Design a protein around this ligand. Structure first.
Ligand code: HEM
Ligand code: HEM
Ligand SMILES: Nc1ncnc2[nH]cnc12
Ligand SMILES: Nc1ncnc2[nH]cnc12
Lengths: 379, 375
């Protein structure tokens, strides 16, 4: 038979039809990823939340040689604490007001130049960069170069491409350099890392690998989610009116946008460490399982009228940060990051709308996120 | 009815235009507005429309004529003296300076880099800022308005006018700066209104639509030039071995380039027999440059970049009355860029398979969204 292809659609302003048809007809389906390998696409909420919590489905092993891949790869010590005190909003008391300031300078720059403007280049991208620069404790001077490296880092490619490794070691280098500076870094994950290799009980390259992969994962995540948040806010201006009128609903509203957003454009991958029956399908050890977040978060068995943005849902047990052992360790930084972004957004640009019909946004191909290459708006 | 636009993928000639030219060099097509149009796709018939004044360009912007996409005095002296090769004695060395900083910046950081944001875009803005005598300070804002100005839409869209009047406003400001502008088309403009024998609106209009057309035409072309050099390294080796062949190369590259994503529009004023087709007065005629510049009747083995062609009378700069008044600048801008490129990054190559470059939709030009290269 002909197998379904994965990924589904770079267009992210409606749920792809295919996601719905899969979850309905075959919530576990053998699909053909872009590398040519075959994997199992889990597209319903019950079975998705199962794979994320069942630890016989491993993440680490997706990086092993010769296991099947959805796309080619592009890349222990008590460091955990340094990470987790970096990822608590309660370990940077100043974070919230600073981000509020960041978001307002960016927006005031745009207001002074006047509409239209690209909200990716002029807002989501410098903003997502500034937060992660603070998280690492590096200056926001090279944010364009840094976000540019992300443009290569999270390319999704059928085969391995040179330049992914050159790009890796290029920014690996930049990180190692911020870390070994002559006024040695205090402040930030890097500041926490310097203190760490002075204590008496880990390589600089390993240290930089963490700061990099962290700066990469969160910037690309929060900038993509923020653009999808914004497109929602422009297409459905009633939602902005809701926030201007009722500032307190910002968190629940971000919570729904998280569920509704189509910024994730790969699936969450796992390798089966043992035969498991999942649904009506015997999955064999060593096969690949791809957890399709939008399939789960649009599942009508758990969320009524999933196609409709709704801030007043009784219950919202969505999977936008994943589940299980590998849940996002920055869920709240993400959440905080977006709430402040958007509260500022609706105060400053209350007339916010797209500069042209939605159908004519350019959706980026070949990337880990679905995102519009430019986000032109009016206000 | 066949459909126009042809393809957003600009790394080969769209197989369709080859079928069109071979079978119907003047075929009726369906534009994205849903209007109907005559697509002229062979060299001889393309040249015919471009030199037959009865095929009008101005009347393409007329109300309620058919459209391929939504619309978005003593001045001749000021313009042509700004676009003339021998009118900025230092322009050449300054461009090479720009080219060299931009490339040196990228060598400092290391590969990979994006030659669009990092090279073609600033370079093209730098040239046109100087052309207008304004600082390059806000080139990103300037270039970002190009991103909206030259969108190709089925219907009109609120945001082409706001974007126009936003950037019109910027040019008026530069013009009316209290340290009045000396130098540049703008410095040529202040002088024009202190003469004894034309409004501030129209004056910024000209300066804007010039910065518009030139920066977008030259940045998109340049990136196609680069893609060519990266994919066919032997061509770089040639420009290093024989630097003087840069002129011929920019000419072949111009013939070969696919940056132009629309066709050139005209409105027939009277009925004309063009080819075997009777075009009625008031119908729309779209000249497809890529069809003509790849016509094998005129260019032997058109698919193959050739720096050593005996003759190369291409139409990359148009033809006829409306031939690009800046061909020479264009050529100079491209020659300097590419000389600097093969000397600075001699290993220049794409970071990833060409088939994966993201080609921009819905724009007057075909361009990669990013142009990642290694060296
Ligand atoms: C709104 C933005 C965000 C979204 C939508 C998001 C969502 C996710 C999801 C779904 C995963 C995949 C884990 C899995 O395979 O189950 C993940 C993991 C991860 N992301 Fe996020 N995240 C966001 C914010 C951030 C931020 C701000 C950072 C960086 C500081 C970050 C760091 C990480 C890390 C380190 C992991 C790996 C977790 C593990 O393997 O244990 N992300 N995030
Ligand atoms: C990369 C180089 C360039 C290319 C490929 C190019 C090519 C063309 C083409 C094909 C046309 C259309 C002619 C027609 O409709 O018949 C044109 C005209 C024009 N372009 Fe370019 N050009 C380039 C650079 C420039 C520059 C640097 C400027 C000026 C700043 C410029 C300004 C214009 C103007 C004003 C026209 C209209 C001519 C008229 O209506 O009389 N372009 N160009
Ligand atoms: N590879 C990935 N896929 C989806 N969401 C992510 N968030 C962080 N990394 C991710
Ligand atoms: N609208 C346009 N179409 C094609 N080539 C151009 N060069 C400058 N403007 C152009």
């Amino acid at each position: 038979p002909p197998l379904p292809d994965f990924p589904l659609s770079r267009r992210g302003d409606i749920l792809p039809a295919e996601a719905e048809r899969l979850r309905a007809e075959q919530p576990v389906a053998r699909v053909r990823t872009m590398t040519g390998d075959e994997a199992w696409l889990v597209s319903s909420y019950e079975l998705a939340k199962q794979v994320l919590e069942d630890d016989r489905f491993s993440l680490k092993d997706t990086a092993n040689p010769g296991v099947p891949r959805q796309y080619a790869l592009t890349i222990s010590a008590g460091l955990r604490n340094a990470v987790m005190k970096t990822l608590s909003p309660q370990a940077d008391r100043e974070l919230g007001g600073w981000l509020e300031a960041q978001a307002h300078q960016l927006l005031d720059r745009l207001i002074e130049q006047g509409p239209p403007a690209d909200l990716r280049d002029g807002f989501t991208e410098p903003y997502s960069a500034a937060l992660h620069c603070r998280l690492l404790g590096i200056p926001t001077d090279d944010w364009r170069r840094l976000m540019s490296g992300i443009d290569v880092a999270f390319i999704t490619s059928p085969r391995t491409f040179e330049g992914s490794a050159v790009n890796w070691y290029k920014d690996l280098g930049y990180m190692v350099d911020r870390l070994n500076a002559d006024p040695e870094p205090t402040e930030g994950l890097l500041g926490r890392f310097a203190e760490l290799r002075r204590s008496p009980d880990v390589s600089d390259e390993l240290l930089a690998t963490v700061a990099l992969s962290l700066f990469g994962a969160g910037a690309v995540s929060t900038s993509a989610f923020l653009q999808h948040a914004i497109i929602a806010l422009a297409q459905q201006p009633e939602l902005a009116d809701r926030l201007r009128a009722e500032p307190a609903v910002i968190g629940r509203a971000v919570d729904e946008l998280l569920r509704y957003n189509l910024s994730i454009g790969d699936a969450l991958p796992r390798i089966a460490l043992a035969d498991v029956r999942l649904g009506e399908v015997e999955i064999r050890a060593g096969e690949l399982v791809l957890v399709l977040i939008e399939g789960a978060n649009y599942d009508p068995a758990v969320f009524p009228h999933p196609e409709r943005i709704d801030f007043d849902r009784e219950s919202n047990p969505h999977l936008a940060f994943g589940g299980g052992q590998h849940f996002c360790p920055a869920s709240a930084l993400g959440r905080t990051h977006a709430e402040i972004a958007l509260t500022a957004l609706v105060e400053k640009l209350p007339a916010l709308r797209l500069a042209l019909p939605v159908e004519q946004l350019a959706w980026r191909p070949g990337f880990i996120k679905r995102l519009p290459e430019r986000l032109p708006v009016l206000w």
